[PDB]
Design a binder for this molecule. Structure first.
Ligand SMILES: *[C@](C)(O)C(=O)N(c1ccc2c(c1)oc1ccccc12)[C@@H](C(=O)N[C@@H](C)c1ccc(F)cc1)c1cccnc1
Ligand SMILES: *[C@](C)(O)C(=O)N(c1ccc2c(c1)oc1ccccc12)[C@@H](C(=O)N[C@@H](C)c1ccc(F)cc1)c1cccnc1
Ligand code: NA
Lengths: 301, 305
């Protein structure tokens, strides 16, 4: 019993974090086999952060301009290349700790663990979600760039996020491990702002099901709703639309608990109109939306 | 920026987790040097639960009654002993993945990371606190027994918890790594309840300091109360007493933010009586009490391991 913001065990990623220095900038890199991955803005300089020309900056760099440190062992760069906004540094030594891994690009709504790192060294691990506005609400300080996000379903590490910058609202932006940004963000210091965020409705519903599975009943009601009327209610609370895919996805949790999805939808409607009234659900006083249907089953079954 | 429920990196503890089996019961053990630690109720069978005799049941068992699998590789047991509620199985191989560690017993209100495991395999990690009533509000399913809680300092793992059982109210109970239970519980099948739980005042204050550092300041007020005046407000609302030592520990955060502890206490007093005005603090709609003053200093400054 119980329900926690549960991360994956970070050991497999810890063995991959190294320290990357170019010029005056030191940030984190990800060492897999004989490649170190890191944000390409490490080759940027204090004078040209607004409109760097990355192809021009990289060709001027020699392999020796990159200091890569795995613990206290210096790793020697023997080549480099750029893939979108990720820098790939070829090193002379393969990482003996490389886990079984893949690179995956996730969709808004997906969740992942983050190994927050500084100077190639791990600080802590938390759960996070791809927000609908394609930011992530992380915990990152200066020097965290290069920190990665990942899942470890079934002994295989799925890398899905590399941290590149903090936006003016205090939330965070980054790329998949192929260098493509999540959202309309760019690795420059030009004025760019997160769109209005919204609540991940299918995740809220997944979480209310987990609440039922753990013995909470008090938010339930005798009403049901249509998909269309619930979506009309959703949009008025900045909630993501609920689709038929989402309803299908909630099928198993519906069958475990005996509550039809649209019945749970009527509950969510009521909670939005009324609030908690001094109460909690699974120890929170807000509707949680960073637990997916897959997370609930993972941690309840 | 940002503030999350942050666990310690779990790599050093993952390499110590092993599967222990005794009869039909399978659970997790902690392989340190050449000893494997696990809950002593692994030698109970379902007839033994009501009132088990651990002394007797252990004498009448052989070293190879204990299947110890480190992954796919079987660890040969060469001795065994009991200490309080923990089973110590000496083995023929020192764990090459043993980190620098020690055994610590934590105080109520203090936090740790839990590495939840099933069949000797780490599946999850999360942060949680030793409640004032010596339960922990964990997330554990059948098979979780033997999962461990820990803190890290520099490069030393402080093991402070081992999971033994779940109570009827869904919260969890366990021991230190010396086998002493936290709280008034026993490792047999019986009705067990804990004293009523309370809110860790000093952690709520630490958490409000975290919100201020993160620009969340709507709850701040111009007012300052006293230790005694707050402590009566605390009793009314079932908060742990706030001591001068608590005030001292919060000193760093006081200096960094410019908000004296008894100023913040006036803010906490006002939140306790007036609710939270439909507003959030650090993305929560209640008073978070599972962040110590040190946990705040860790996320907000970037302490590394
Ligand atoms: C990284 C380097 O470790 C870091 O922490 N931050 C950062 C600094 C400089 C950056 C950057 C990110 O991204 C780029 C792109 C191009 C040129 C320079 C550069 C900082 C951070 O993001 N700071 C803000 C002010 C920022 C935004 C956009 C930008 F182009 C530059 C700087 C950081 C701080 C807190 C949490 N994460 C990252
Ligand atoms: C363990 C085996 O991994 C486990 O998950 N649980 C458990 C099972 C049997 C136990 C036990 C704990 O503690 C004892 C003591 C003495 C004899 C047997 C035995 C279960 C769990 O705690 N089940 C509860 C109902 C329980 C309590 C006390 C008891 F004597 C028997 C059973 C568990 C389930 C979820 C999370 N943690 C533990
Ligand atoms: Na340096």
């Amino acid at each position: 019993s119980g329900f926690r913001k549960m991360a994956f065990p970070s050991g497999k990623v810890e063995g991959c974090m190294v320290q990357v220095t170019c010029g005056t900038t030191t940030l984190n890199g990800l060492w897999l086999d004989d490649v170190v991955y890191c944000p390409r803005h490490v080759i940027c300089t204090s004078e040209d952060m607004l409109n760097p020309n990355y192809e021009d900056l990289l060709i001027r760099k020699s392999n020796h301009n990159f200091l890569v440190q795995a613990g206290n062992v210096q790793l020697r760069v023997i080549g480099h290349s750029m893939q979108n906004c990720v820098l790939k540094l070829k090193v002379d030594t393969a990482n003996p700790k490389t886990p079984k891994y893949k690179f995956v690009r996730i969709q808004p709504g997906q969740t992942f663990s983050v190994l927050a790192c500084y100077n190639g060294s791990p600080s802590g691990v938390y759960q996070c979600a791809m927000r609908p506005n394609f930011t992530i609400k992380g915990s990152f300080l200066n020097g965290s760039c290069g920190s990665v996000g990942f899942n470890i379903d079934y002994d295989c590490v799925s890398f899905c996020y590399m941290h590149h910058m903090e936006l003016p609202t205090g939330v965070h932006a980054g790329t998949d491990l192929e260098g493509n940004f999540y959202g309309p963000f760019v690795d420059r210091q030009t004025a760019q702002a997160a769109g209005t965020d919204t609540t991940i409705t299918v995740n809220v519903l997944a979480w209310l099901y987990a609440a039922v599975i753990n013995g909470d009943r008090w938010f339930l009601n005798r009403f049901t709703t249509t998909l269309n009327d619930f979506n009309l209610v959703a949009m008025k609370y900045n909630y993501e639309p609920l689709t038929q895919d989402h309803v299908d996805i909630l099928g198993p949790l519906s069958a475990q608990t005996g509550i039809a999805v649209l019945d749970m939808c009527a509950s969510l409607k009521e909670l939005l109109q009324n609030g908690m009234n001094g109460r909690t659900i699974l120890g929170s006083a807000l509707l949680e939306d960073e637990f997916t249907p897959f997370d609930v089953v993972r941690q309840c079954s």
